[PDB]
C-alpha cells in the first residue's frame with residue numbers, strides 16, 4: 362500500500378474516465394459537497410426502505 | 412500531462428506514477444488550466460521552457 366493524498370487519487374480516477382484532471386481541482390468543493398449529500402441520501406434511504 | 416509532481420526536498424520534478432523517473436518540469440510535461448486562486452494545495456515553483464533558450468541565443 363502506497364500513501365497518496367485523496368485529492369490526487371480522485372485526480373487519477375477522473376483521468377481514468379477521460380476527463381482532464383484540472384476539472385477535479387477546479388471543482389473540488391462542489392464534488393465534496395455532492396459526495397457528502399449522496400452519502401446522506403444513502404443513509405436516509407437505507408433507514409426507511411426495508 | 413502524464414505523471415505527478417514530486418519533490419526530493421528542494422527541487423520539483425514530474426515523474427510517472429508507477430515508477431520513479433524524475434524529469435525537469437517543462438511545457439512538454441504540463442498543461443495550463445485556470446489560475447492560482449482556486450486549486451487547493453497548489454505550490455510555487457518555476458517551469459523551464461525549452462523554447463526560451465533557442466530564441467534568446
Ligand SMILES: *[C@@H]1O[C@H](CO)[C@@H](O[C@@H]2O[C@H](CO)[C@@H](O)[C@H](O)[C@H]2NC(C)=O)[C@H](O)[C@H]1NC(C)=O
Nearest residue numbers: 417418419420421422423424433434435436459
Ligand atoms: C534533489 O535533486 C536535485 C537534482 O539532482 C539536487 O540538486 C543537484 O545536486 C547535485 C549534487 O548531488 C548537483 O551536482 C546538481 O548540480 C544539483 N542540481 C542543480 C539543478 O543544481 C538536490 O541536491 C536534491 N536535493 C536533495 C535534498 O536531495
Ligand SMILES: *[C@@H]1O[C@H](CO)[C@@H](O[C@@H]2O[C@H](CO)[C@@H](O)[C@H](O)[C@H]2NC(C)=O)[C@H](O)[C@H]1NC(C)=O
Nearest residue numbers: 446447448449450451452453454455456457458
Ligand atoms: C506563491 O507566489 C505568489 C505570487 O506569485 C504569492 O502571492 C502573494 O500572496 C501574498 C499574500 O496575499 C501577497 O501579499 C503578495 O502580493 C502575493 N504576490 C504577488 C506577486 O502578488 C503566494 O503567496 C505564493 N505562495 C507560496 C505558498 O509560495
Ligand SMILES: *[C@@H]1O[C@H](CO)[C@@H](O)[C@H](O)[C@H]1NC(C)=O
Nearest residue numbers: 366367368450451452453454
Ligand atoms: C495539509 O495539512 C496541513 C496540516 O497537516 C495543513 O496545514 C495544510 O494547509 C494542508 N494543505 C492542504 C493542501 O490540504
